[PDB]
Amino acid sequence: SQQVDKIKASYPLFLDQDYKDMLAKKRDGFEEKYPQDKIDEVFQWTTTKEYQELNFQREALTVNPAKACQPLGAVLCALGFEKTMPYVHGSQGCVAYFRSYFNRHFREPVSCVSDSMTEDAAVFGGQQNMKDGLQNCKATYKPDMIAVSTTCMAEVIGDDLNAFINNSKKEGFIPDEFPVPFAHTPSFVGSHVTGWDNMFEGIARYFTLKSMDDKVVGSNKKINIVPGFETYLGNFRVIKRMLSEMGVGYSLLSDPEEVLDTPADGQFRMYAGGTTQEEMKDAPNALNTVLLQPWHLEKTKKFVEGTWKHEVPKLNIPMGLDWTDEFLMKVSEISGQPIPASLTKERGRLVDMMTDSHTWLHGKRFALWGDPDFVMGLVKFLLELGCEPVHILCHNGNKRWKKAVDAILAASPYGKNATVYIGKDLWHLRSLVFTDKPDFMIGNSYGKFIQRDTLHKGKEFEVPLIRIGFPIFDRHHLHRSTTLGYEGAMQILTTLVNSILERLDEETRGMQATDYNHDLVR
């Protein structure tokens, strides 16, 4: 039933007695459900150290991964180029998923095509799909560039992208001069970040390899900035804002911040902003190239060092106080621009905020996950705040990365109770937050199911999620946030301290029980 002036959606409609009784009868009649006491028994067992030990012995089964596949990163990278259509050679199912995944995070259109390879291509390969696909895409969507990646069926079948694209031009499906950079992006190697690196390096090679004879390092007096896989608009914006404030000439190579934030003014804009083809062609003339997320830009780095001859600096992601300082000092050195009064003041404002909030942050224990550079910068900043990052999980991390994070942990007293996990998933993390309970999780929307599980054990066992990462689907507009630089550090500090104080308010809201500590001032 419904009352018209107070209509109920699923929650709380299905809590009405008639629905409750109906669902009980469905269960008892037809579902042959395990008895509740058995369900409670198994639940309790899944929270134990014994179960954790079995869980960590898994070799074949993955449960609740914290990574995605290569072509998703290739698509994000390609979106950062002016009037560029991302184009994934292979199966169309993949592209529906890539678009939807980004649609849900940015709450924006995400444009990408497939060339719709089917079972028949296993006989004859995907060449005709490539010819018709490029022609059709160019005519229909009027991109100035098509950036090609692959799905896993194209990889297994073994289609030669380079030959297919060259043949498309040779036979007149598209003009010879029309830019079609490409990268092989096998889903069974690495993760979405590897796809980003592969795509970027393919675009860099397209515009520069054959034309290196006339390049002179430093002749354009700019610094190239490569952001990597980046899903916060504020991260692209803050880097450009800091370099501009410093009077540093720069080129941001892959910049989707406009195309991922078009205004609602009565027209749809399929393309907006983006790195120009001229910026990529001219990039070897820069002073140097800085990689914002070096732990997933290894292939890019080899190309930039081997072909452009840039002395890429050994910089961590610019997250937290020390690493933002180091990034600005290196940019000052390369550019010969002094760090301006404006950034020195911003820095001291962040430090002010650290002094103001340190008492509530001190010793707070966190579980966290994400991509390698993001995770290591979050760890570093947590140590700067006097917090303990006790469970650090990077599903798509490697041994060399883990060693690097372990060195950062060993240099701080706040790192003494921390462990770094690689190749482990959120079903592994779930055990750890039961057996060695932290105060909070910092993670993406998949964390909400771990919070749900912890509450089921009891309110005193609940570990609240703080949403920083990718994807965030169950809150609106958090993709507008910043996590880099002083601004990002200010935003993260504010989020953490206020999460702590929200939870303390909750625990002290009980009239004549816990509200002796429900302070007006904190």
Partner 1 sequence: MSREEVESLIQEVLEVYPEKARKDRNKHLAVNDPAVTQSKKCIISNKKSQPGLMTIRGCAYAGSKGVVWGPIKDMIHISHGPVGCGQYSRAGRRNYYIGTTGVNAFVTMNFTSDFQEKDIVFGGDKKLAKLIDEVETLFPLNKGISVQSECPIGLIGDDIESVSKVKGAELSKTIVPVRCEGFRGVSQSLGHHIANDAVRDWVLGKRDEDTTFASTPYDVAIIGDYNIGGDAWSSRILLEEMGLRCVAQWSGDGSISEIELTPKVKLNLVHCYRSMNYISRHMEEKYGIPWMEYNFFGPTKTIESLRAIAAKFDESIQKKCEEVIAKYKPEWEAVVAKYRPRLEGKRVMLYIGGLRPRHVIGAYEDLGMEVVGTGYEFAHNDDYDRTMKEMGDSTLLYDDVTGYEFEEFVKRIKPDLIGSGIKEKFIFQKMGIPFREMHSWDYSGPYHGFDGFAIFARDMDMTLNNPCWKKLQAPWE
Give the binding site for Ca ion (CB under 5 A).
107-108, 352, 356
CA distance 476 to 491: 16
How many Cα atoms occupy the beta-carbon half-sphere of 493 within 13 Å?
Answer: 29
| 57: number of Cβ within 10 Å | 7
CB of 217 to partner 1, least distance (A): 25
Query: Under rule CB under 8 A, which residues in 243-282 are in contact with partner 1?
Result: 262-269
Shortest distance (Å) from residue 356 CB to Ca ion: 4
Q: Which of 152, 259, 312, 433 is catalytic?
A: 152
Stretch that binds partner 1, among 3-11, 250-258, 300-308, 433-441 (CB under 8 A): 3-11
| Stretch 12-41 residues interacting with Mg ion (CB under 5 A) | 12
Task: Tell me whether residue 69 is annotated as binding.
Answer: yes
CB of 517 closer than 8 Å to CB of 506: no
Sequence letter at residue 33: K
Kindly state whether residue 341 participates in binding partner 1, applying the rule CB under 8 A: no
Stretch that binds its own copies, among 123-131, 289-297, 345-353, 419-427 (CB under 8 A): 345-353
506 in Cβ contact with 519 (< 8 Å): no
Q: Judged by CB, which is closer to Ca ion: 108, or 436?
A: 108
Query: 508 touches which of Mg ion, Ca ion, its own copies, none (CB within 5 to 8 A by kind)?
Result: its own copies
189 lies in the site for its own copies, by CB under 8 A = no
Q: Which residues, at least 6 apart from 10, have a Cβ–Cβ distance to it below 8 Å?
A: none
State which residue, 12 or 158, has the beta carbon closest to Mg ion: 12
**Which of residues 58 and 522 has its CB atom nearest to its own copies in the complex?**
522
Residues in a beta bridge with 485: 319
Site membership for partner 1, residue 315 (CB under 8 A):
no
- Alpha carbon separation from 266 to 82, 107, 181, 257, 269 (Å, rounded): 22, 17, 33, 20, 10
For its own copies, the closer of residues 164 and 446 by Cβ is 446
- Using the contact rule CB under 5 A, the part of the chain among 17-25, 66-74, 99-107, 316-324 near Mg ion is 99-107
* Cα–Cα distance, 409 to 419 (Å, whole number): 9
Which of 170, 345, 362, 403 contacts its own copies by CB under 8 A? 345
CB-nearer residue toward partner 1: 307 or 495 = 495
Instruction: State yes or no: residue 516 binds its own copies (CB under 8 A).
Output: yes
Point out which span in 221-229, 283-291, 318-326, 474-482 binds its own copies (CB under 8 A): 474-482
Q: Answer yes or no whether residue 509 interacts with its own copies by CB under 8 A.
A: yes
Return the residue matching tokens 């289609």: 159
Distance of CA 257 to the CA centre of its chain: 14
Going across the sheet that includes 288-291, the strands are 250-252, 223-226, 288-291
SS3 call for 39: helix
Q: Annotation-wise, does 187 bind a ligand?
A: yes
Smallest distance, its own copies to C-beta of residue 451, A: 7
Residue 471 burial (C-beta neighbours within 10 Å; 0-12, 13-18, 19+): middle
Per-residue b or e along 333-359, where b marks 16 or more CB atoms closer than 10 Å to that residue's CB: ebbebebbeebeebbeebeebbeebee
155-163, 256-264, 294-302, 376-384 -> range binding its own copies (CB under 8 A):
256-264
Q: Indicate if 152 belongs to the active site.
A: yes
Count other Cβ atoms within 10 Å, centred on residue 189.
14
Residue 354 CB, shortest distance to its own copies, in Å, is 8
Contact predicate 290/315, CB 8 Å: yes
Closer to Ca ion at the Cβ: 58 or 349?
349
CA-wise closest residue to 121 among 82, 87, 72, 155: 155
Q: Which does 384 bind (CB under 5 to 8 A by kind): its own copies, partner 1, Mg ion, none?
A: partner 1
Going along 164-241, which residue ranges are E strands? 223-226
Whose Cβ is closer to Mg ion: residue 147's or residue 500's? 500
- The answer to whether 356 contacts its own copies (rule: CB under 8 A) is yes
Using CB under 8 A as the criterion, which residues of the chain lie in contact with its own copies when the complex forms?
9-12, 14-15, 104, 107, 261-265, 344-345, 347-349, 351-357, 360, 445-446, 448-449, 451-453, 455-456, 473-478, 480, 490, 493-494, 497-498, 501-502, 504-505, 507-511, 514-522
Positions marked catalytic: 152, 156
